[PDB]
Design a protein around this ligand. Sequence first.
Ligand code: QN8
Ligand code: QN8
Ligand code: QN8
Ligand code: QN8
Ligand code: QNN
Ligand code: QNN
Ligand code: QNN
Ligand code: QNN
Ligand code: QNN
Ligand code: QNN
Ligand code: ZN
Ligand code: ZN
Ligand code: ZN
Ligand code: ZN
Lengths: 190, 186, 191, 189
Amino acid sequence: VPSQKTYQGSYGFRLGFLHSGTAKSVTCTYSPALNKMFCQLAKTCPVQLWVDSTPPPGTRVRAMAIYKQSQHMTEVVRRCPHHERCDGLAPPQHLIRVEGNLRVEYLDDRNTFRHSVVVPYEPPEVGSDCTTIHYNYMCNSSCMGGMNRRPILTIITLEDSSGNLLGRNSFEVCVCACPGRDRRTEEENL
Amino acid sequence: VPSQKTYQGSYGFRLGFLHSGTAKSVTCTYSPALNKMFCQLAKTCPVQLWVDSTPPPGTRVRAMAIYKQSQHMTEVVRRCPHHERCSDGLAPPQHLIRVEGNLRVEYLDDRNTFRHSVVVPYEPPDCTTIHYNYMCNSSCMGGMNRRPILTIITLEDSSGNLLGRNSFEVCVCACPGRDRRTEEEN
Amino acid sequence: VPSQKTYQGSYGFRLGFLHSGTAKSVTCTYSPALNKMFCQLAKTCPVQLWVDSTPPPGTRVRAMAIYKQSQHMTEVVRRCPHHERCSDSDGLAPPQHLIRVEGNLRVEYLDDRNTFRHSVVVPYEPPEVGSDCTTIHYNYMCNSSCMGGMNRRPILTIITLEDSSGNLLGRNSFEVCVCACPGRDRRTEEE
Amino acid sequence: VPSQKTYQGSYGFRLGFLHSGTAKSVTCTYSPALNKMFCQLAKTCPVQLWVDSTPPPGTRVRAMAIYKQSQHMTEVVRRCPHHERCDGLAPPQHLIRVEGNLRVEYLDDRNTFRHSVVVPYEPPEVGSDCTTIHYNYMCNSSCMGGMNRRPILTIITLEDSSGNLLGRNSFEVCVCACPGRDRRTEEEN
Ligand SMILES: *C[C@@H]1C(=O)C2CCN1CC2
Ligand SMILES: *C[C@@H]1C(=O)C2CCN1CC2
Ligand SMILES: *C[C@@H]1C(=O)C2CCN1CC2
Ligand SMILES: *C[C@@H]1C(=O)C2CCN1CC2
Ligand SMILES: *C[C@H]1C(=O)C2CCN1CC2
Ligand SMILES: *C[C@H]1C(=O)C2CCN1CC2
Ligand SMILES: *C[C@H]1C(=O)C2CCN1CC2
Ligand SMILES: *C[C@H]1C(=O)C2CCN1CC2
Ligand SMILES: *C[C@H]1C(=O)C2CCN1CC2
Ligand SMILES: *C[C@H]1C(=O)C2CCN1CC2
Ligand SMILES: [Zn+2]
Ligand SMILES: [Zn+2]
Ligand SMILES: [Zn+2]
Ligand SMILES: [Zn+2]
């Protein structure tokens, strides 16, 4: 199973998320207490990259989903049969897409059969302190043919142009209709 | 500029404050005559919620800081760059107002106004108390820089409908007891 | 494992370091309490050599890094795969070597044929006109936190004074952190 | 030339000193009339920090010596060659050390070449009203090749974690064999 161990590494790599709140109209919202992103099917899911020093051009950022529970960790996370039968760049089986990036790259691992999506690292824009990638999750947590309500973790890895690992972080993910209500409910139960 | 007007609304919503006095040891103290809270950096600032009838479960209580002077009211109130680099794991580093001791605390960066606020669930008690922390001094250059602020406390239902609103002024300074006594002399 | 045992030897060989303090912007700074240098990736790290009597011409000054923890001491300290990738600023130095010397055209780098350890050596030069010490500017080419390299493990640098034929004359050592803000890391560690 | 202007600042920074008197046995004694400390070489010289409100954690306290006389003020105060010979954590050239503090930090200023010593500000223990720092002076005022009978001032500055001035005070210092007699004799004039 792919490592999920957090490493800030040489560049001080960590993730951040918008402080979106839990209003009914929010389409994605992150829970710091749960380290868990709540988002809507195929909607924009901003993840921020925070670094202490700037990685060189050529650095790449990879995202991969794995099942959190130990008895499902060896199963490849993929879309359900229904949603797979629905882009011109992403493989129809992949749960995680990146939108708004024409240099996006998709991988089916030839040995593990796991799916991942990678984009070029770009430094923050002029007035910004973080790089933002817009992920899309293409299947509901409740899709019976896929995750089937099993919790998943998204692993974000920073790697150089030769594939050497530079840092790693991760967050749990829920894909459901009303992420504001779901966040509020799950924090009530803790 | 977000609305600052007082409204007790349907539930008779008001704010209360402990009668802590101005002895040297006080870590925070409220002046009724100035409707002003004097507190210390990152120390407990208790605010009581008074209601004539209980809001339904799912009610929420929001706090937001705004500059009091009309020439500064459109500037977002945020921590100075020094303190923003100076976390509880839950709060954004730029936010002036935190809530301590509440694991269901939620923080908002408004996508369009860019203003900061902190919201907790309303819990029934004879008063509901929220422990706020103010994370930047009134005197911080680059932050409030000696400009007066108001904290706006809003009661909202679970759908975000406004139920009531109150407010108070706040000082964040090293000796709240001495500051209150001095300003009330003028 | 090469020796880290301090020995002033017959020339009274000692190390000195600038008294730089811990301001946030300082580029390197040494902690006497920790016998530890805090420096930045690829930036100047001055180390002073102090001798009681002047070593003969042909004397050489070697620097080598070793891991401090016993379960890693037989591992060669080297740059991580990421940083060991060749660059156009490598110059006179092997791309795998953690420790460089800057501003010295007579610098020499060694991959030991038998132990595979890396080291960098320069001629010993006596202090200039109105000076009491000789300064060498080292650069450390990999952060302490580099994945696939030091990977947060602590290291020592061993400075040896050698004769023209390589016999040990003197030896000292110090620990090294390579991090983004040495002033902060030192002030925080001394708490 | 560093500032010696007294500056109580926002925290109400003041110095205090023990009321030690001038008996023969005393090793450090302060003259209020002269604002001048009389202490022996390398012995404990206590200096109290008094504040009206507690400065934040991360505050630091710096000490630096300058020559009191205007015609010597640009000369760096340092130890004489005799005493400078190589001790613990301190640089051998530094006149002013701090005793009993593992977090002490010493600075040779890269631009002014001045020496100084810095420790973290600690608040007074609950019950106590002031913070004491134990300084040591490592050269006699009479040392040939060092101070050479020239009077010096010790400047104590309060700074925040980024080095910004919060407060400043100063006092004269005389390092000599018998501080009690020296103080008593100097107050006769
Ligand atoms: C992290 C960055 C910033 O500095 C602000 C908030 C979110 N992104 C874009 C603007
Ligand atoms: C040891 C030498 C000197 O005599 C001064 C201080 C540090 N180095 C360079 C100049
Ligand atoms: C700077 C180094 C490191 O990276 C860890 C923590 C402190 N030192 C020793 C090990
Ligand atoms: C240091 C003292 C003085 O002030 C003078 C000269 C030497 N001792 C005795 C008298
Ligand atoms: C997203 C949500 C679900 O639907 C189950 C897995 C994780 N989280 C809790 C239960
Ligand atoms: C808290 C105190 C200050 O520091 C200024 C703004 C508000 N109040 C009066 C002056
Ligand atoms: C980059 C690579 C080369 O091409 C030679 C010089 C340094 N490195 C090893 C050999
Ligand atoms: C310590 C670190 C910082 O935070 C900036 C100034 C100096 N150094 C590089 C960037
Ligand atoms: C602050 C000062 C005093 O007044 C006594 C107690 C502690 N310190 C030394 C003596
Ligand atoms: C210590 C004594 C001296 O030797 C001169 C300077 C200060 N004090 C008075 C004169
Ligand atoms: Zn599906
Ligand atoms: Zn501030
Ligand atoms: Zn590296
Ligand atoms: Zn002397």
